[PDB]
Design a protein around this ligand. Sequence first.
Ligand code: YGV
Length: 161
Amino acid sequence: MNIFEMLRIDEGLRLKIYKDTEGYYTIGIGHLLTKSPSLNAAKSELDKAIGRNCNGVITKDEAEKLFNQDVDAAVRGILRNAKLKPVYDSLDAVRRCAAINMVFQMGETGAGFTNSLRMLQQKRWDEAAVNLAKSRWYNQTPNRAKRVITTFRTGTWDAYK
Ligand SMILES: CSc1ccccc1Cl
């Protein structure tokens, strides 16, 4: 298990434009295209991302390439963020995957987790797990949030096996 396998489980793989759990146009392994309601706007973002005229459809290789870029962007965003980096650097490798997973899903802005971050940095795992669940995130995607929270609570891959 690694961050790629973990997010591939959580996001699935679809080769044609779809809507995510929030109703936003997406493709591949959870690659957000746009929050605009315009499918044409989403198709333009897709063509820009892939470098060719895609008509809303990509190959598996292209989906995996976008996915690698997206995971890397989440990691680099953590490392550039003065609030997130110290917490991330305090974690073991398995829990770092849970952190990347959250940033992939919600972005750096998706900021309100200050108290959870403090508990995680303090290694108060059960308390952090309780706090993480008091969130729109948990209520709207509870099965995925439960898996991520179990990963933070235990430092194991048990929720994904
Ligand atoms: C909200 S999860 C997270 C994100 C960035 C760095 C560390 C953590 Cl625990």
